[PDB]
Design a protein around this ligand. Structure first.
Ligand code: HEM
Ligand code: HEM
Ligand code: HEM
Ligand code: HEM
Lengths: 345, 345, 345, 345
């Protein structure tokens, strides 16, 4: 259409609100808020999926130019803003009293009446690994009984996640080229030179206690650099789940963080930063959600079957559920400006 | 139902998104965001109306006890939070480029494709007076052509607004009773005594310039108190639109602000405070909205017919559109703690 | 004075900014931001302490009337707002690049150059128990070497915390009186009656699987109520650190949450709610802080001595550091409106 | 130093808080908050000035490369975040009751005790023109009596503002070169061609009413383009204060908004966007400030000398006080993607 309500299909949208306590002649005022809050979330979930899918398609290519990079940054930044908004929607629902919630929670399935298809789709499309999930809601068949739902989740798991496609993009970054700039080799070399210089400076320290601390610290630094310079050590950290990136992907990430001030790397950096922001904001939502759940129905209530639901949500707060874990730690491997191999080529 | 998607009618809700540039084989990515943003707004608009109507019904009674007062405070506070959220939704849409918006704005009616029924309902239910509106969108028939829409707006105008019902509630407040506490009389008396004391203190001022400033100020204070103590002056200020409250309503408001620290008046105060917050937040939304409009289509663009739409929105920012204008100014009439007639009875 | 800058002592305040990289002829622009950010925090920390101390003094009395209650609510609400602001200050500092921070971090003591006296004072004044802290920064002497600092922290530990004084206030709440309303006894009775009614309804269930789930659930409910109705079980939960309140304090808390809709209990409830908000916001700050630290210097960097600092901060995120832990769980013990003993007396 | 409190000069910073109602044996609790709130503002004001000055110095050069551009974007973005924070500090102070403020406002000079040197410095450094200010506080000598203050304000007025330096930068943008890309000429040409095409399409319209609206609209579009293509019309709009940019600066701005999707223009665009954000946020602060003032002391109170202070603040809300007014309107001159001259050279 052309008129507001026809274009936005408001006749459909605003007829999707059925208060179950109302049609059962025992009306609870706040049930209206409950419905609207979730529906607002669900609309935004759909937008997030829509942005995610379009970024997946753009990343599923051999060449990502500067122009498409900007478009991705924009869309990731948009998701960040939506996520902040979703974090702030929780205190609106927290405004309903526990006793009011109790008077209509009976109209809801114990665990099925609280699980969102779209949220699970967001997790998978972002890159939450199935094996990283806790035992409780690990298999999606146990969570969702519907058939069309199962097909979507299966598709989300099999299809390339945002985690996978970012890794492939990270592997192709210019500068890791042995033939060209050869950053990894130059990096190792400057780590050796910088650390050597550090040992000599520490040996010249007048106070004995200060010498020992610096020597101990330099040794702890060697162990850090061993975990990135020895591919065997890295692959081990991947297998136990302390890292997620392939070795070459981490190489790309580290290079980006190094030259982030440089016009050629500023946008790739921004992309990574927004990836972290998204991860962190999802965690922030999780935290707010669990505080609200506990505020409403404690750790356990009638019909809840004990405290396993609460304990599950509390365990989703762990780094096991963070998709871009490697990104948070990248400054661990950082050396000062002077020691970084200059960009010339 | 009992399962998430059945309860929230997600099959209806998530089938209300029709991108018109998509079905016309010229797809603009950001059109999806455009639709979702408005739909999120519309869902919240429905919640605001739902909260407003329930407050209207509660206020449409001769006796409002302490218990129902708390429930009203809660619901007004809920509306405040929703409004803050709606203010923060604007920068999400501002993330779409003007050039992208240009590629699908043709699918929208020039002024009809931007006017929301529910928003207009919120304005009227809150208490925006029709005569206070600017010439442009004053008559609702010119704005909305639909029949069911016209009936709702007509009903919103005729039915008691939040402004009306608050006034009636304000008129009944205990303490304005000549037989009882007789606040208005005690107030006048203490104004006289306080002002008298101020004149004498000013006459004793050593510096001549300081004496004159204080004497001029006391005269400006008399004029202030004349505008509330002389009903003729008040009624005149109502007629020209500088005030909205009846004389007795303003008397109630002023008393509440005076004893706001007192347990018996703290909730009535909170109610008034949230009324102001709501007004101010609607203004804050208006401001953000106009900045976004100008960011997208400037003051005027192709098909827009010049700059009358923009100038209209810019004029909605005036105090003519604020419903609880009297509330913002109440501290003008304030006298210090010592001069306020103590609560005894 | 009377003029802005004299009153606010701006000559002192704005002469407290000494960039150490500047006077050492190697200036880092962002060091100015680093200083200002902390100084803004420190000013707010002082305000929080000032509000806390005044609430401590008000609670350190046998009778807290309705009027003083409102004043406490106001001041706790003020602290909430300040805390939200402090949470939002982190992304401002996150705007400094790691490489820029590296160029001036040498001017700072490894662990001493990051520890705030006032923050530690806030923790203790709120009620963080010393034994609940992790091994790393448990004893304040190891943290702070200064003499005046040690005296303040010692005073904060020995003096009655906000946790202690709230408990005493909770113990005195009217309604726990055996002679009067006798809530605890009435509560036990209605738990028995409600649970009995639940067993009979479960026995009448047609489906066998549904009968068993409900019977298992009712058994899990008995265990919940045993932990509050048997003082021995409660005291055990206190000793291991799962609870903090005395038995009578928890009794008070539970009663408040039950009749929160009632004018006489709404403010006491609000007080408890703000206590939770404060706790949660401190946790939210902790989370943001740790994300920023990792963004700047990873899990470990040169001079840092390995990853013990990072791991410490990450462990401050546990419920061991939450002061009002009991408050978060109160809805666990909730029974529906009908089953709650009515207020008559 | 190396320890937290020595580095941050906390002994100086935390000794700058003198409550005047306290030393005069009539203590008002909230006076502490009043002081801290302003001091927090003042610290941030100093940071804003510090960021502004460093951007001024960077822009005061003939060549601004891609690298320095990024640094400017970063610092403008930092100012945006600080400004949002400052907007959110107002509701913290709004938490003090009017009656409490009344009990210590006597210790403050009527207009001098509310004027901030640093704020005035921010306004001038950003680019608020002296002639654009209202009569009330137009001359700084009338506002500030101190000598060192007068010298700083004089220096801020004479020295190149952020407005001036951005204009010069805008004038030099590559693409306005007649010898090179020649954007202005290509732009005029494509406006003619696009408008011609619009007339023909309008003439072919079946409905007569629709033909007339489109013809009227095209005429309104010609008037828009006349105001930018005829330098005489532009210069007139500058003189009356509807525009601020020189003709060539506006040419630069318009080109940037056109090719904002292009890697070469994305950062220059971002710079302009943040300039608008800063302007708008200052306006948002102004609005919040005036609402708070009215909440505390109404439109006028004892000692205030009538309502001129309030009316002044309310007039600072006009576009006369917006520095980058031209930037808000740039989409007015926009033509669709197809009609824009492609970047080749
Ligand atoms: C009265 C308010 C609410 C309560 C008591 C509540 C309770 C719960 C509980 C107990 C679970 C665990 C499900 C299970 O047993 O397996 C859960 C999961 C979830 N909830 Fe809520 N919830 C509330 C509001 C919301 C809102 C407003 C949203 C926004 C869409 C939401 C989104 C979710 C999502 C996405 C999950 C799955 C989480 C995961 O698997 O990590 N909830 N909720
Ligand atoms: C590309 C983004 C947008 C543009 C260009 C835009 C433009 C406009 C224009 C030009 C008007 C005046 C209508 C007239 O000519 O009479 C208007 C009114 C309105 N708009 Fe928007 N708008 C946008 C987004 C939104 C969003 C996201 C909402 C949220 C529901 C919204 C809500 C309204 C409302 C409620 C009115 C009526 C205002 C009143 O009468 O005071 N707009 N808009
Ligand atoms: C470049 C930015 C920052 C870094 C790298 C940083 C790093 C750290 C580290 C490593 C610790 C642990 C101290 C230890 O080793 O024992 C710490 C503690 C702390 N930091 Fe920061 N910090 C930063 C900014 C801030 C800011 C802006 C504040 C606000 C006042 C702040 C407040 C604290 C407080 C209060 C503690 C003690 C925490 C506790 O004991 O639980 N920090 N910081
Ligand atoms: C009880 C709270 C406050 C009241 C009643 C108040 C009142 C005023 C008044 C009446 C003016 C006009 C001055 C004149 O007469 O010429 C003013 C100006 C100003 N105030 Fe406040 N103020 C308050 C809090 C603040 C705070 C927290 C800040 C933050 C630094 C602030 C910053 C300013 C600034 C920067 C101006 C100059 C504005 C301009 O010239 O456009 N004020 N204030």
């Amino acid at each position: 259409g052309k008129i507001y309500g026809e274009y936005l299909m408001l006749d459909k949208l605003l007829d999707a609100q059925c208060m179950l306590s109302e049609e059962d002649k025992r009306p609870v005022h706040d049930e209206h808020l409950f419905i609207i809050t979730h529906q607002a979330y669900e609309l935004w979930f759909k937008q997030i999926i829509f942005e995610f899918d379009s970024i997946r398609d753009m990343l599923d290519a051999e060449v990502i130019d500067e122009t498409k990079t900007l478009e991705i940054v924009k869309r990731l930044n948009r998701v960040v803003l939506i996520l902040k908004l979703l974090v702030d929607q929780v205190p609106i629902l927290e405004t309903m009293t526990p006793l009011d919630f109790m008077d209509f929670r009976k109209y809801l399935a114990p665990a099925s009446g609280f699980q969102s298809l779209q949220f699970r789709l967001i997790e998978n499309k972002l890159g939450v690994l199935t094996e990283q999930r806790v035992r409780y809601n690990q298999k999606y068949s146990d969570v969702f009984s519907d058939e069309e739902a199962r097909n979507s989740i299966r598709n989300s798991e099999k299809d390339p996640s945002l985690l996978e496609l970012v890794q492939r993009w990270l592997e192709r970054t210019p500068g890791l080229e042995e033939s060209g700039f050869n950053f990894w080799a130059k990096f190792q070399e400057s780590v050796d030179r910088f650390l050597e210089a550090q040992v000599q400076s520490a040996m010249e320290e007048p106070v004995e206690k200060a010498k020992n601390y610096r020597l101990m610290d330099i040794e702890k630094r060697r162990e850090v650099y061993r975990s990135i310079f020895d591919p065997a050590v890295h692959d081990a950290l991947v297998r136990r789940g302390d890292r997620r990136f392939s070795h070459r992907a981490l190489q790309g990430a580290i290079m980006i963080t190094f030259y982030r001030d440089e016009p050629r790397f500023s946008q790739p950096h921004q992309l990574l930063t927004l990836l972290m922001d998204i991860d962190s904001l999802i965690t922030k939502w999780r935290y707010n959600h669990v505080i609200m759940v506990q505020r409403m129905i404690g750790s356990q209530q009638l019909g809840t079957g004990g405290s396993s639901g609460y304990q599950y949500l509390r365990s989703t707060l762990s780094d096991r559920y963070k998709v871009f874990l490697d990104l948070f730690n990248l400054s661990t491997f950082l050396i000062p400006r002077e020691a970084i191999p200059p960009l010339d080529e």
